[model samples]
Target: SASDIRMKKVMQYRRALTKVVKLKTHLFSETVKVTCSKDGEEVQWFKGKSTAGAQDRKKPSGGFPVDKITSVKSQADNTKVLVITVNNPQPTTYNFTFKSPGERESWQEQIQSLMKFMSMK
Candidate 1:
């Protein structure tokens, strides 16, 4: 039964090699590489390299836990900017601009999903 829970929480990572979204944040001015997690709402990213393939993750640098996100909001009167608020190790927020609302919603939903999943555990 213990293994069952572990199996259920096992990570199913997905490479977004073909789905790169150039995101800019206060903490990150340069383009960051982000990979979606298939099993959860977690995102793995690198500072200056693409975390697309196996070799790329060998020395993987940084990433954020979407489960810690507190709120998601679309900002800038006309810009497709999605602002994400997270209350984690510290109070912080990230800004991301996507090409479409659907795209932004997709990321938001993933984070929300992760939070719910983690809470149940």
Candidate 2:
């Protein structure tokens, strides 16, 4: 477990750009903290909060291949929410929020580019 944790800490171990993004699903009201893994062979995630030490480090939540993602739609009617639709056994969605419009835009661009990059691979 330690080795795995250590490996997860390696910036290169994961090809995705990791960031603490807030995720909100249909099941949730407020967004929860989740590490957004953007890029690489697929998109991945880790859910947790930040603390003083490694004891509170995020755990590997889950991820899916890029193609499994059916769409990434931006909804700015009220607040900015990046709606990520996944084509699983049932259609699923992951909505992410950022503190600022700039941050949201940056993430939107990164994810869009990654999806495009993976689409060709």
Candidate 3:
């Protein structure tokens, strides 16, 4: 059906644009292209451009299952930062800074929704 095909395409290409705050790896945060897999099962982050099928394709620098994510929230002090908590081996939090507070909020909301959806199945 057309509706199912549309849904499939949407799920296959869901992604977010933000900068990951890496305290250990780098002195400052770097922009990353984050993608959520179809069926909302996993999320992956790529460096720089988010364009689909760009040249010099390489593995995603980092990724994790949606089920492993425990929570998603925005920092009280910094509205532009989105905090994601994941329970991988041990509980850990990752910070992502968006261009604006609205973008941060949308990312937080979508991540939480995906987490919730994955847990139910």
Candidate 2 regions exceeding 4 Å error are 1-16, 27-39, 50-59, 76-78
Of the candidates shown, which would achieve the greatest TM-score relative to the real structure?
3
**Cα lDDT of model 2 by residue, 6-119, tens digit:** 345433424334555677786354434433332244665555533513543333455566666788777756266677787862577877776775565566666666566545
**Best candidate, lDDT:** 3
lDDT of each: 0.53, 0.57, 0.59
Q: What is the lDDT, from 0 to 100, of the residue 102 in candidate 1?
A: 64
Q: Give lDDT tens digits, candidate 3, residues 1-121.
A: 7557544644633554232332212323667767665555676676564544444323566667778887766678856666777777356566776666576666777676656655655
Per-model TM-score, in order, reads: 0.59, 0.63, 0.67
TM-score of 1: 0.59
Error (Å) of candidate 2 at residue 18 is 1.6
lDDT of 1 at 27: 64
TM-score of the candidate numbered 2? 0.63
Model 1, 16-101: lDDT tens digits are: 22134456676665555555444444555565654545764544354555566566565766255557676663555666556765
Which pairs of residues collide in model 3? none
Worst lDDT run of 10 residues, candidate 3, spans 18-27
Q: List candidate 3 stretches off by more than 4 Å.
A: 1-28, 49-58, 89-91
Clashing pairs for predicted structure model 2, backbone only: none
